Design an enzyme around this catalytic site. Structure first.
Site, PDB file in Angstrom:
ATOM      1  N   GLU A 208       0.792  -1.215  -0.097  1.00 20.18           N
ATOM      2  CA  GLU A 208       0.119   0.112  -0.033  1.00 20.18           C
ATOM      3  C   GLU A 208       0.841   1.213   0.068  1.00 20.18           C
ATOM      4  O   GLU A 208       0.483   2.246  -0.612  1.00 20.18           O
ATOM      5  CB  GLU A 208      -0.753  -0.113   1.112  1.00 20.18           C
ATOM      6  CG  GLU A 208      -2.012  -1.127   0.952  1.00 20.18           C
ATOM      7  CD  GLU A 208      -2.994  -0.901   2.036  1.00 20.18           C
ATOM      8  OE1 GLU A 208      -3.103  -0.013   3.059  1.00 20.18           O
ATOM      9  OE2 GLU A 208      -4.033  -1.537   2.402  1.00 20.18           O
ATOM     10  N   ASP A 217      -6.664  10.828   0.148  1.00 19.01           N
ATOM     11  CA  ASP A 217      -6.851   9.322  -0.524  1.00 19.01           C
ATOM     12  C   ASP A 217      -7.786   9.551  -1.809  1.00 19.01           C
ATOM     13  O   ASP A 217      -8.043  10.530  -2.117  1.00 19.01           O
ATOM     14  CB  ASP A 217      -7.162   8.378   0.490  1.00 19.01           C
ATOM     15  CG  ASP A 217      -8.591   8.446   0.940  1.00 19.01           C
ATOM     16  OD1 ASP A 217      -9.161   9.473   0.327  1.00 19.01           O
ATOM     17  OD2 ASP A 217      -9.068   7.881   1.630  1.00 19.01           O
TER      18      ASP A 217
END
Ligand SMILES: CCNC(=O)[C@H]1O[C@@H](n2cnc3c(NCC(c4ccccc4)c4ccccc4)nc(C(=O)NCCNC(=O)NC4CCN(c5ccccn5)CC4)nc32)[C@H](O)[C@@H]1O
Ligand SMILES: CCCCCCCC/C=C\CCCCCCCC(=O)OC[C@H](O)CO
Length: 444
Positions: A208, A217
């Protein structure tokens, strides 16, 4: 054959070698677009600096060893250039090393920090410092202010025009030693990253990513660390405030790697508690070892429990420890089809129970560390002998002098930097290596 003829021949041979090899490096980057990245902006700059060293600096360095009668400043100019052109190589080399530090150590912020414009701006700063440092003696720090050649003339030798306190204090410490210590610190850092202890934290950092600053995000929400959502509020101040609460101290939207790991372990605690409360995932999570549990958590972090619980068939095989059958089954889902890289690493973890798939991914850094060891070793071998010699001649004049062949060898070594350091780094790159093969076979 007397020594001078040996020195000139060797010095000239190195000139050609420095030109041939560094032309190759620029040629490869010119035709192969896979090499037209920002890292090879610095690589080509160094190759340019090194072609000038072979073309101009070496013939100058030779010239300032013959000792003919010359105007003191005319001989000083010759000497300063070889200083300039060689300074240009050192700093250019230092730029490549640093580009590699960021690229390996901080890959997510790399593309932002190091762009074509920032690169060309740094290459510019390198040449400006080279001219400033190299031409400093022309400003007044020279041995010209004061029989054999006449008035205004001196025997054109390097030491006769360039002072030794400039070569030790300014040139060696500030412009040769510091870069070496910097480059060495780069190598050791990358070495520790390539050989890092692996764990669920490192696993998720690989899959990630790690962000020590606040960022929006995919869903526009402020996030930090490894996908740790701070708030859905549009207020950066609110995100910063939630961050401080979880960390304790006042962060300003910036945390240390050690703090992101404390946030992460709390997210892991959360994920497990949810696994334990899921009737489908609980029996499997209990029946797995630590490393396979970590791979189960890797899936939760990506899809959530309901998404993981949808793998009824694959879960069944895992509880019965049918690793092989569980693996091939997991290879079928749209999870695999949409993120094959990550799913392939997670499955290998299920199948083997080791970090293998995640240590295989560090071999690229291992390759990077060894390439830099060669850069710093060759740099120390090529430049330290000559400048150590100056230091002894400056701090201890009455000391036992080294023989002429070892002294002039140090000069030869200092100029061999221009033929090995850039080229050897290029030749350790598959793309470069294949491009070199294609161009020499065809054109030559
Ligand atoms: C980015 C950094 N760039 C560089 O460092 C570049 O600068 C040049 N350089 C850097 N220190 C250099 C340097 N030190 C001077 C050093 C020396 C001389 C010769 C060989 C190596 C080092 C020295 C040592 C001892 C005494 C004075 C100077 N002498 C030369 C360069 O041509 N010498 C050639 C022309 N002189 C000479 O035969 N003298 C002779 C040397 C032998 N005798 C000695 C020996 C001991 C004691 C006294 N008398 C008589 C004078 N060149 C240099 C070289 O191109 C580097 O690549
Ligand atoms: C960086 C520019 C620094 C320029 C420093 C000039 C030094 C100078 O002019 O004098 C030094 C003197 O020879 C000492 O004994």
């Amino acid at each position: 054959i007397m020594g001078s003829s040996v020195y000139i021949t060797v010095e000239l041979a190195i000139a050609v070698l420095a030109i041939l090899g560094n032309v190759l490096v620029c040629w490869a980057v010119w035709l192969n677009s896979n090499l037209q990245n920002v890292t090879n902006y610095f690589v080509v700059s160094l190759a340019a600096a090194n072609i000038a060293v072979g073309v101009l600096a070496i013939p100058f360095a030779i010239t300032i060893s013959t000792g003919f009668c010359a105007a003191c400043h005319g001989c000083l100019f010759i000497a300063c250039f070889v200083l300039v052109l060689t300074q240009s190589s050192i700093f250019s080399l230092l730029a490549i090393a640093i580009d590699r530090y960021i690229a390996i150590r901080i890959p997510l912020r790399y593309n932002g920090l190091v762009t074509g414009t920032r690169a060309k701006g740094i290459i510019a700063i390198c040449w400006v410092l080279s001219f400033a440092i190299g031409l400093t003696p022309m400003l007044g720090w020279n041995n010209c202010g004061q029989q054999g050649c006449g008035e205004g003339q001196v025997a054109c030798l390097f030491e006769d025009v360039v002072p030794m306190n400039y070569m030790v204090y300014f040139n060696f410490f500030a412009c040769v030693l510091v870069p070496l210590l910097l480059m060495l610190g780069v190598y050791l850092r990358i070495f520790l990253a390539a050989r890092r202890q692996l764990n669920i934290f490192e696993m998720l950092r690989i899959d990630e990513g790690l962000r020590l600053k606040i960022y929006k995000d995919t869903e526009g929400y402020y996030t930090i660390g490894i996908g740790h959502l701070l708030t859905k509020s549009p207020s950066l101040n609110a995100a910063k405030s939630e961050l401080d609460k979880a960390i304790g101290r006042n962060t300003n939207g910036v945390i240390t790697k050690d703090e992101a790991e404390k946030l992460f372990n709390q997210d892991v605690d959360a994920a497990v508690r949810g696994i334990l409360r899921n009737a489908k995932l609980k029996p499997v999570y209990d029946s797995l070892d630590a490393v396979r549990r970590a791979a189960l958590i890797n899936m939760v972090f990506q899809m959530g429990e309901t998404g993981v619980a949808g793998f009824t068939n694959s879960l069944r095989m895992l509880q019965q420890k049918r690793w092989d059958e569980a693996a091939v089954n997991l290879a079928k889902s749209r999870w695999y089809n949409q993120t094959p890289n990550r799913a392939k690493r997670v499955i290998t973890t299920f199948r083997t129970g080791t970090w293998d798939a995640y240590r295989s991914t560090l071999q690229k850094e291992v390759h990077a560390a060894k390439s830099l060891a060669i850069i710093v070793g060759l740099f120390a071998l090529c430049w330290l002998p000559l400048h150590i010699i100056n230091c002894f001649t400056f701090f201890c004049p009455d000391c036992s002098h080294a023989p002429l062949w070892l002294m002039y060898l140090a000069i030869v070594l200092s100029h061999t930097n221009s033929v090995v350091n850039p080229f050897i780094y290029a030749y350790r790159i598959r793309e470069f290596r294949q491009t070199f093969r294609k161009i020499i076979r065809s054109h030559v």
